[PDB]
Amino acid sequence: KIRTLQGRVVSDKMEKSIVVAIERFVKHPIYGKFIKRTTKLHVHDENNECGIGDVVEIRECRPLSKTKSWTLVRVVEKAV
Amino acid sequence: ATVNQLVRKPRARKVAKSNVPALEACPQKRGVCTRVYTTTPKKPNSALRKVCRVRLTNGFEVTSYIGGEGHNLQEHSVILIRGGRVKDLPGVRYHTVRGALDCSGVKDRKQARSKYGVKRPKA
Amino acid sequence: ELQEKLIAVNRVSKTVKGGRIFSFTALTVVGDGNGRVGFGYGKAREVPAAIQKAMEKARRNMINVALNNGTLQHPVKGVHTGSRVFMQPASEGTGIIAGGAMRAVLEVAGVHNVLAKAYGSTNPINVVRATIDGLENMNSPEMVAAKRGK
Amino acid sequence: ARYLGPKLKLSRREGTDLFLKSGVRAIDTKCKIEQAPGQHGARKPRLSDYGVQLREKQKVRRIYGVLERQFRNYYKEAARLKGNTGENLLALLEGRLDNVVYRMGFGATRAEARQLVSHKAIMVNGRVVNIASYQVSPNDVVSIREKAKKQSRVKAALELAEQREKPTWLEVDAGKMEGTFKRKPERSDLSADINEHLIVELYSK
Amino acid sequence: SMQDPIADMLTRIRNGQAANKAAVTMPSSKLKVAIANVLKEEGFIEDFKVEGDTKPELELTLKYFQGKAVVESIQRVSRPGLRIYKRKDELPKVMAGLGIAVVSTSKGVMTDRAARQAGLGGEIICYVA
RNA sequence: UAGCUAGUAGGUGGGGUAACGGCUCACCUAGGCGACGAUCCCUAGCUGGUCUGAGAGGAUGACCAGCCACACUGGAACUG
RNA sequence: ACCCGCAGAAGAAGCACCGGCUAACUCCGUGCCAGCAGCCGCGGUAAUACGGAGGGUGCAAGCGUUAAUCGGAAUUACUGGGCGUAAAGCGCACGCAGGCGGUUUGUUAAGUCAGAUGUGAAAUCCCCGGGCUCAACCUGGGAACUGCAUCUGAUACUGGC
RNA sequence: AGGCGGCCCCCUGGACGAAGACUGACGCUCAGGUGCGAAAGCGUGGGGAGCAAACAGGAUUAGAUACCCUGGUAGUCCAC
RNA sequence: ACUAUGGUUUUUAUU
Structure with a gap:
């Protein structure tokens, strides 16, 4: 069992890389209402098949590349 | 505030800052003194008042109050200055110390002998 | 037991021909020592006569409060025109606390375990009328055990 | 102070x-x-x-x-x-040492009892105490050092304490110069x- | 159109008794019906009824007695913007024992009594007195 | 402090490193950042703790149990 | 460190307040002049307010004074302020995104709640066995750390589809 | 919304009802944005009956800087 | 079609 985060693709313009916006819905550090604060992350993808507007699941390693440690483990749903 | 407010702009504190800033958070400092002046009685309060121009150790030049009967203060005396307001004068925030240096004591004093410079100067 | 208190003796300006003339107002609380509260106010040109005209009214009307196990049950609010008073059950003797426009109203009713806040208003003659509202807003459980089903 | x-x-x-x-x-x-x-x-x-x-x-x-x-x-x-x-x-x-030493009759006044305590004459449970603000309990033994057991001022205070009406919550003997609490002080005496x-x-x- | 259905349910109940009305009506939901169930089952309302299939609508019959007002304070505490939760050790007291509390738990809408007898905590639905 | 990057942004074969990463060379690519504030720049060590209120919070990190980073002022790393 | 003894009253006190608020007071000087300092306000002849007295009142190897700062301060206010005249409704509009979103089946189980397993050293707040006379302080037993992580369940209400 | 009034002809946004028919959450507020002018003033030309800042002509008055009183430019008006 | 210029300070609170 692995602990994995989900998000939406925001760029795919790289033959081995994507950019993802994580579905991070959290309570504010000093206020009580839950808010969207979606992390924009650089993620490894060696199938190069998913594109902008897709829904994805990610796992953490290991540092993989420059300032990157997360990789694609499931394409959850296609655009639109 | 609503459940959506203060989220983008959190509440930011208003700072008041020092009333006696020329002393730089110290209680008392030396001042050389250059000029002595007198001022007008304030409407119903029938007495004339005395003040001086004093440069401090840190280079600030401020208006110092002179309380008590009698004064020997002049140009380059080198005397001790304190924080002390006078609510009968416009903007008077600084006061003089009698118990130190060139300064003569207050005349006719015999009570409250720890203040007012009642102890004789050295010669 | 039986408490009997003077809350405030105050001056009035009373501007007249020749400038001003001497005049005073007084506020007192008496009730029946337990379970009933009663208050009075009076005005005179001397303090002992203003206190008389307050005390001569302090039994004229009484307000009954329902208690169980010697005191009141829950935190409670009460209001008057231009005044609000809120009360919270706290420590007996060590939780009193509050001035006569609040505490003395409960002392003459047999309550010594409750603290109070006005959150604004301070004029004793208008604050006391908002404390006297909360005693009729507080609900004691014994005589209301048939007001809903089951 | x-x-x-x-x-x-x-x-x-x-x-x-x-x-x-x-x-x-x-x-x-x-x-x-x-x-x-x-x-x-x-x-x-x-x-x-x-x-x-x-x-x-x-x-x-x-x-x-x-x-x-x-x-x-x-x-x-x-x-x-x-x-x-x-x-x-x-x-x-009532239970502080200089008031207890006064009630037991070792000194005729609360200040005479305090002078005996600060000048190292008084003992609690067989050891010397110079703190007048010390709180005393039941069965804490109050006694005196031999070079003060001779002292005529203490004998005269104990001799006056038998010519005045007595605190009955405590026990004391001038022949040994020793006393203890037996009850709390009672507000009905x-x-x-x-x-x-x-x-x-x-x-x- | 409707931004808080339960603020309308609570306003329709609280003010309906202050309008001295026999019954009040609204679009029906399995949340409104579960809130009406515990309000009937703890003796604060007299009946609740639903009619319709494609436009289901709720009618609440208000409870009356020899005195004045059967519902004296009906406070939601927890709202869809800012929710308020309670835990087993601290399940709430209402007006020092004059009232009771309602919670959604992990099972359904119930009293703080029925929650503490299963070991459950959760979100506040209402404090009723 | 509204537009800003271009070893900046992602790869391929080697170098270096205890290992990791443009830390780095040669080649391929045209990407990257921004209302959840990129550009740009003044102050400031960090915790266990310490003060304060009943709490939120605000003030304080010197007391000694561990860490930081400096060593005339700057640079290099060597030895281990 | 500490103790046991011994002459000899011997070697050991000042400082601030006393009009009203504020417990401790009115005589002599000054004469709206000079001096005052928490605030309201004092003084042109009888000044409890200034300066001095004699007498009180209060602290005491300390007395009075002071800087920054927490509380009270809901005084940058989720907790917990305010918006017709007080400080403030965007001069008036259409609007996406964001926020909120009628009612229902099925699903995911993040948010929430219930339960395991790990952990927050020592000193210090709290209770307590010891040490020293009180106690600072120093030890020995109890004890607190809502969390985060590897795991287990519930489907009410939202989020997700 | 500051604004819109003697009376025609031709185009036009929005409010409101009676009975029927489709969409099937379509509502509702709006950061930033892009929009709507009353008067005064302006840019570019046209126009100028009455009135009228500025200004001149005479009194009033200590002065007259204002009231009084005749003229009169900017403006009042138009397409923009 | 009417006038510039005369400053400034004050009291009852006790039984």
């Missing part, structure tokens, strides 16, 4: 006797009481109503010889016991001049 000023003048301000510095020089005859306090202190009252609750508080302090910060400490240390906190304040001031209604609510403005 301490108080060292005159002790009779405290009665002039209270208008009654505090029973400070007891001796036949200040009993039944020539005592005067009040008359003319200070130089102008008897012209016109005034006093107002805060002076009454201050002077009651100061009467407790001056009887037991205790200072403002220690009297604030006894007001914290005292318990309400479903009644009044000031009642247990008077019980802690002990009496006071202090109004308990003005010491119930303190340090709350």
Whole structure:
């Protein structure tokens, strides 16, 4: 069992890389209402098949590349 | 505030800052003194008042109050200055110390002998 | 037991021909020592006569409060025109606390375990009328055990 | 810290006797009481109503010889016991070593008992104690050192304590110079001049 | 159109008794019906009824007695913007025992009594007195 | 402090490193950042703790149990 | 460190307040002049307010004074302020995104709640066995750390589809 | 919304009802944005009956700087 | 079609 985060693709313009916006819905550090604060992350993808507007699941390693440690483990749903 | 407010702009504190800033958070400092002046009685309060121009150790030049009967203060005396307001004068925030240096004591004093410079100067 | 208190003796300006003339107002609380509260106010040109005209009214009307196990049950609010008073059950003797426009109203009713806040208003003659509202807003459980089903 | 000023003048301000510095020089005859306090202190009252609750508080302090910060400490240390906190304040001031050494008759006055304590003459449970503010419990043994067991001032105070009416919550023997508590002080044998209604609510403005 | 259906339910109940009305009506939901169930089952309302299939609508019959007002304070505490939760050790007291509390738990809408007898905590639905 | 990057942004074969990463060379690519504030720049060590209120919060990180980073002022790393 | 003894009253006190608020007071000087300092306000002849007295009142190897700062301060206010005249409704509009979103089946189980397993050293707040006379302080037993992580369940209400 | 009034002909946004028919959450507020002018003033030309800042002509008054009183430019008006 | 210029300070609160 692995602990994995989900998000939406925001760029795919790289033959081995994507950019993802994580579905991070959290309570504010000093206020009580839950808010969207979606992390924009650089993620490894060696199938190069998913594109902008897709829904994805990610796992953490290991540092993989420059300032990157997360990789694609499931394409959850296609655009639109 | 609503459940959506203060989220983008959190509440930011208003700072008041020092009333006696020329002393730089110290209680008392030396001042050389250059000029002595007198001022007008304030409407119903029938007495004339005395003040001086004093440069401090840190280079600030401020208006110092002179309380008590009698004064020997002049140009380059080198005397001790304190924080002390006078609510009968416009903007008077600084006061003089009698118990130190060139300064003569207050005349006719015999009570409250720890203040007012009642102890004789050295010669 | 039986408490009997003077809350405030105050001056009035009373501007007249020749400038001003001497005049005073007084506020007192008496009730029946337990379970009933009663208050009075009076005005005179001397303090002992203003206190008389307050005390001569302090039994004229009484307000009954329902208690169980010697005191009141829950935190409670009460209001008057231009005044609000809120009360919270706290420590007996060590939780009193509050001035006569609040505490003395409960002392003459047999309550010594409750603290109070006005959150604004301070004029004793208008604050006391908002404390006297909360005693009729507080609900004691014994005589209301048939007001809903089951 | 301490108080060292005159002790009779405290009665002039209270208008009654505090029973400070007891001796036949200040009993039944020539005592005067009040008359003319200070130089102008008897012209016109005034006093107002805060002076009454201050002077009651100061009467407790001056009887037991205790200072403002220690009297604030006894007001914290005292318990309400479903009644009044000031009642247990008077019980802690009865159970402090210099008042206990006074009740047991080793010194004829509360200050004579304090002088014996600070000058290293007094023992608790077989060891020397010089703290007059020490709190005593049931079965704590109060006794005296041999070079003070000889002292005529202590013998005369114990010889006066058998010619005055006795505190019955404690046991003492002058032949050995040793005593203990056997019960707490009982308010149905002990009496006071202090109004308990003005010491119930303190340090709350 | 409707931004808080339960603020309308609570306003329709609280003010309906102050309008001295026999019954009040609204679009029906399995949340409104579960709130009406515990209000009937703890004796604060007299009946609740639903009619319709494609437009289901709720009618609440208000409870009356010899005195004045059967519902005296009906406070939601927890709202869809800012929710308020309670835990087993601290399940709430209402008006020092004059009232009771309602919670959604992990099972359904119930009293703080029925929650503490299963060991459950959760979101506040209402405090009723 | 509204437009800003271009070893900046992602790869391929080697170098270096205890290992990791443009830390780095040669070649391929045209990407990257921004209302959840990129550009740009003044102050400031960090915790266990310490003060304060009943709490939220605000003030304080010197007391000694561990860490930081400096060593005339700057640079290099060597030895281990 | 500490103890056991011994002459000899011997070697050991000042400082601030006392008009009203505020418990401790009115005589002599000054004469709206000079001096004052928490605030209201004091003083032109009888000044309890200035300066001094004699007498009180209060602290005491300390007395009075002071800087920054927490509380009270709901005084940058989720907790917990305010918006017709007080400080403030965007001069008036259309609007996406964001926020909120009628009613229902099925699903995911993040948010929430219930339960395991790990952990927050020592000193210090709290209770307590010891040490020293009180106690600072120093030890020995109890004890607190809502969390985060590896795991287990519930489907009410939202989020997700 | 500051604004819109003697009376025609031709185009036009929005409010409101009676009975029927489709969409099937379509509502509702709006950061930033892009929009709507009353008067005064302006840019570019046209126009000028009455009135009228500025200004001149005479009194009033200590002065007259204003009231009084005749003229009169900017403006009042138009397409923009 | 009417006038510039005469400053400034004050009291009852006790039983």
